[PDB]
């Protein structure tokens, strides 16, 4: 299977900022990639469209994917409330890495983070499943609205999302 590509159209307080696209590593983690893909297309009747990045730490990562509570306490997977760590074949190698947020082992939901740095200390604890293809500059632009404690100065939003290929 060819690795699928998804896009996020980002908005800052409603104003369009730009598009970020991701390659999803379905050749390593097909279940984890499939969950993110479907949530990006909304094909199950729910997903990332209109959701926010609740926690952004400059020099670290942008966290989003909580489309039910919008604060880190919510979201769900297409398989149910949570699913297992598929594997840890892939590592947090640098900026642009796409990885699953969790609340400890085997609690993957819908929450994810886009790395803006190498996050090696997270290897083996968080399932890496994708990488930014185009629009890393948009991620960099998103980053400036975060803070050391994660709170964002403006509402950073996924205005639209879907699958490109």
């Amino acid at each position: 299977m060819v690795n699928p590509t998804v896009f996020f159209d980002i908005a800052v307080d409603g104003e369009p900022l730009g598009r970020v696209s991701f390659e999803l590593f379905a050749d390593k983690v097909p279940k984890t990639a499939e969950n993110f893909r479907a949530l990006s297309t909304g094909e199950k009747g729910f997903g990332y469209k209109g959701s926010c990045f609740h926690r952004i730490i400059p020099g670290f990562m942008c966290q989003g994917g909580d489309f039910t509570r919008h604060n880190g306490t919510g979201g769900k997977s297409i398989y149910g409330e949570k699913f297992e760590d598929e594997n840890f074949i892939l590592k947090h190698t640098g900026p642009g890495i796409l990885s699953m947020a969790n609340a400890g082992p085997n609690t993957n939901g819908s929450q994810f983070f886009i790395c803006t740095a190498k996050t090696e200390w997270l290897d083996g604890k968080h399932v890496v499943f994708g990488k930014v293809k185009e629009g890393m500059n948009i991620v960099e632009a998103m980053e400036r609205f975060g803070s050391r404690n994660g709170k964002t100065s403006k509402k950073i939003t996924i205005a639209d999302c879907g699958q490109l290929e």
């Binding site: 670290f60 979201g75 947020a101 609340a103 983070f113 996050t119 997270l122 994660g150």
Partner: peptide, 11 residues
């Protein structure tokens, strides 16, 4: 610290 967690955010 620098974690990415869902619910209980730690240092």
């Amino acid at each position: 610290x620098l974690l990415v967690x869902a619910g209980l955010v730690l240092a």
